[PDB]
Structure formats: C-alpha cells, structure tokens
Amino acid sequence: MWSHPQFEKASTGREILEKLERREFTREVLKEALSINDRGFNEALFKLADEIRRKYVGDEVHIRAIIEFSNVCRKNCLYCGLRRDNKNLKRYRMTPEEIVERARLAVQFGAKTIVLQSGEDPYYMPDVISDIVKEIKKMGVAVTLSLGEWPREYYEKWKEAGADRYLLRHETANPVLHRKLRPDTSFENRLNCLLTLKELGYETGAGSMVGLPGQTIDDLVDDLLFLKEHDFDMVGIGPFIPHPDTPLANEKKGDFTLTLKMVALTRILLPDSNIPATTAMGTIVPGGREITLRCGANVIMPNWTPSPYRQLYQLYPGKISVFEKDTASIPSVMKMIELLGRKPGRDWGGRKRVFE
Ligand SMILES: Nc1ncnc2c1ncn2[C@@H]1O[C@H](CSC[C@H](N)C(=O)O)[C@@H](O)[C@H]1O
Ligand code: SF4
Numbered sequence: 001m002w003s004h005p006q007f008e009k010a011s012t013g014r015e016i017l018e019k020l021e022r023r024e025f026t027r028e029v030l031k032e033a034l035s036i037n038d039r040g041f042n043e044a045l046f047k048l049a050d051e052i053r054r055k056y057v058g059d060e061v062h063i064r065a066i067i068e069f070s071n072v073c074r075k076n077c078l079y080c081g082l083r084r085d086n087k088n089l090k091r092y093r094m095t096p097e098e099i100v101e102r103a104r105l106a107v108q109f110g111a112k113t114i115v116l117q118s119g120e121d122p123y124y125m126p127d128v129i130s131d132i133v134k135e136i137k138k139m140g141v142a143v144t145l146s147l148g149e150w151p152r153e154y155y156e157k158w159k160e161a162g163a164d165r166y167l168l169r170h171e172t173a174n175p176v177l178h179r180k181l182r183p184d185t186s187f188e189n190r191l192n193c194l195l196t197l198k199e200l201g202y203e204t205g206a207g208s209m210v211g212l213p214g215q216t217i218d219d220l221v222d223d224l225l226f227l228k229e230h231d232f233d234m235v236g237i238g239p240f241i242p243h244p245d246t247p248l249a250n251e252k253k254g255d256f257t258l259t260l261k262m263v264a265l266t267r268i269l270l271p272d273s274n275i276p277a278t279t280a281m282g283t284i285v286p287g288g289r290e291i292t293l294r295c296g297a298n299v300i301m302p303n304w305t306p307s308p309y310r311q312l313y314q315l316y317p318g319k320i321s322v323f324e325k326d327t328a329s330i331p332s333v334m335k336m337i338e339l340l341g342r343k344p345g346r347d348w349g350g351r352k353r354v355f356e
C-alpha cells in the first residue's frame with residue numbers, strides 16, 4: 001500500500017471556487033464548500049454569490065411586509081413555539097378588518113407585497129382568507145400567503161381570490177428527519193403541497209432551516225439539490241433557533257456562518273430567485289440581515305404585525321423587539337437598504353427569468 005496524502009487546503013478551496021464559478025454543481029463540490037471552515041474561502045464564496053445577485057437580480061431589495069395574523073396552530077412541530085402542545089403562550093386571532101386595515105397601512109408606507117402568515121388556524125380556512133386576499137388585492141400590491149399545509153381546494157380558492165405567491169418552507173428534505181420533527185405530517189405531504197401550488201400558478205417559495213437537531217452536512221447538500229431541482233421562485237433560509245417551551249429547547253442553535261453559506265450557495269444555484277435575508281438571520285447576529293444582503297439575498301420582510309399581537313408570535317426567542325413602535329419596521333428597512341447602497345423595489349418584485 002502507498003500513501004494517500006491530502007491536497008493542500010488552500011489549493012483545494014480554490015478548486016472548489018472554480019468549480020462553482022463554472023457551475024459544476026456536484027454533490028461532493030457542494031459538500032466540500034459547506035465543510036471548509038476557512039475565512040478566506042467563505043469570503044470568496046460570499047463575493048461570488050453577491051456577484052451573481054448583482055448580475056441577475058440587480059440592486060433592488062424588495063420589501064415584503066409580514067402580518068402574522070394568528071398564532072393558533074393545529075400542528076405540533078418540535079422546533080416551533082406555536083406548536084399546539086405549548087400551553088405557555090397566549091394565543092390570538094386578528095379580525096379580517098384588523099388585517100385588511102393593517103395591510104392598507106403597510107401599502108401606504110410603501111410595501112409592494114403583503115405577506116399573510118399564521119399558524120395552521122382552521123378558523124380562517126378557506127373563506128375568511130379569500131375575503132381578506134380580495135380586499136388587499138384591491139390596494140394594488142402583490143399578496144403572498146404562508147399558512148401551512150391545506151387541501152388543493154383551499155389553495156385553488158385563494159388563487160382565484162388573487163393571491164400571487166405562497167411560501168411553504170420545506171424545512172428539511174430528509175424525510176426521516178422531517179417526520180421526526182413534524183410528527184403530524186411528512187416531507188411527501190409538504191412536497192405535494194409545493195407541487196400543487198406551482199401547478200395552480202403561484203410563485204412558490206421553499207427553503208430549509210440550518211442546524212436542526214439530527215441534520216448533517218449531507219442533509220444540507222440534499223436541501224440545496226432539492227431547491228435546484230424545483231427551480232423555486234423564492235427560497236427562505238435561516239438558522240434553527242431553539243425555543244425553551246419546546247422539546248428541542250436544549251439543542252444546539254444553528255450556525256450563522258453555515259447558514260450564510262447556504263444563502264450564498266442558493267443564490268449561486270438559482271441566480272434569479274428571490275432570496276430573503278430572513279428574520280432569524282437578524283435575530284441570531286446583530287446586523288445579520290444586512291450581512292445576508294451582501295451574501296446573495298435580495299429581499300427583506302419587515303415585521304408588520306401590530307401590538308399587542310406581535311410579541312405573541314413567538315416562533316423562536318428573540319424574534320420580536322418590543323423596544324419600538326409597531327410601525328417602525330418599514331421605515332427602518334428602508335433606511336437599512338439606503339445605507340447598503342441598494343434601492344427599494346420599484347414594482348412587485350416577482351421572480352423573473354433572466355439567467356440562461
Ligand atoms: N425554532 C425555529 N427557528 C427558526 N425558524 C423557525 C422555528 N420555528 C418555526 N420556524 C420557521 O417559521 C416558519 C413559518 S411558520 C408558517 C406556517 N405555519 C408553516 O409552518 O409553514 C416555518 O417555515 C419555520 O421554518
Ligand atoms: S412551524 Fe408552522 S405548522 Fe409547525 S407548529 Fe409552527 S406555526 Fe404550526
């Protein structure tokens with residue numbers, strides 16, 4: 001037997017970058033990119049994603065104002081503070097009038113997309129949602145729904161009511177892990193919902209959490225390849241943030257740098273997709289969303305849920321700041337975008353096909 005020495009790390013890292021620049025997206029290339037822990041490799045990866053972002057989606061940072069209108073949920077996901085078994089949380093529901101008028105205010109502040117997100121709350125489904133969507137569509141903006149897993153019939157009604165997009169983060173593409181963490185449902189169910197949403201003509205959003213308990217680098221590679229496979233219009237990625245009132249309270253938090261590399265690789269794989277700098281990135285690191293916008297992201301989603309409900313939508317700890325008024329977030333992200341040298345979106349910021 002003869003030796004089997006490793007190649008030097010710097011030269012290996014440069015070969016990975018070259019393969020990414022040549023769009024040679026093999027599993028081993030993606031795995032090694034995620035595994036390298038070199039500050040200079042990572043910075044070059046971020047700059048490549050930023051370059052691709054500049055070339056294929058430009059300098060507009062699209063603002064999507066989120067109204068989290070109910071924290072009631074019928075599911076029991078192990079990671080989520082809204083899981084039905086968490087009795088330590090005050091639950092709330094907004095009336096349709098509250099939701100519509102709050103959306104109207106965001107539109108007046110300049111949001112060009114309203115995102116309606118909730119727990120899986122049967123109260124609203126399907127007809128209350130349809131009424132709300134129809135009212136918001138009269139305001140001249142795009143509407144995105146993020147309501148979880150529902151029958152095809154509901155998704156069809158909401159499309160007819162005028163919804164433009166649907167965000168259903170796939171969470172994890174590992175079906176064994178998915179079922180362990182989401183004991184009510186399955187990856188197959190989640191994927192079927194995404195396929196139905198695409199067939200109905202929604203712009204569809206997927207995306208995973210990074211750092212889930214039991215998730216490995218190979219699983220993160222599977223997430224990237226799943227996203228590439230379906231050419232998603234939008235991809236929402238962030239770290240897992242443990243919640244103290246859940247079974248995962250004591251697990252490791254997701255790593256910011258690893259999550260940033262997932263955002264960067266997603267931009268490289270899907271050059272003209274819409275990729276938010278998510279709330280969870282801003283929670284985990286001060287300035288986290290600003291950093292993510294320099295590493296391939298092109299969207300920001302200010303929290304527009306009003307007091308006294310905003311503090312109760314406790315997906316994970318630290319999500320909400322209560323130090324400022326509930327109308328500060330849209331002007332605040334506009335200021336952030338200006339300081340980055342970027343521009344707010346001029347239209348609804350729907351995904352375009354300009355890459356290849
Ligand atoms: N602990 C957590 N850490 C980081 N992110 C978390 C966590 N808990 C939930 N989330 C994220 O919250 C998103 C919106 S819930 C909307 C709807 N009910 C749905 O399930 O699709 C989910 O897709 C998760 O990725
Ligand atoms: S992630 Fe969505 S479906 Fe799961 S418990 Fe939280 S709100 Fe409910």
Ligand SMILES: [C-]#N
Nearest residue numbers: 064144165234
């Ligand atoms: C996303 N809109």
Ligand SMILES: [C-]#N
Nearest residue numbers: 276278279301
């Ligand atoms: C989500 N931002």
Ligand SMILES: [Cl-]
Nearest residue numbers: 234274276299
């Ligand atoms: Cl988006």
Ligand SMILES: [Fe+2]
Nearest residue numbers: 167205234274
């Ligand atoms: Fe989106």
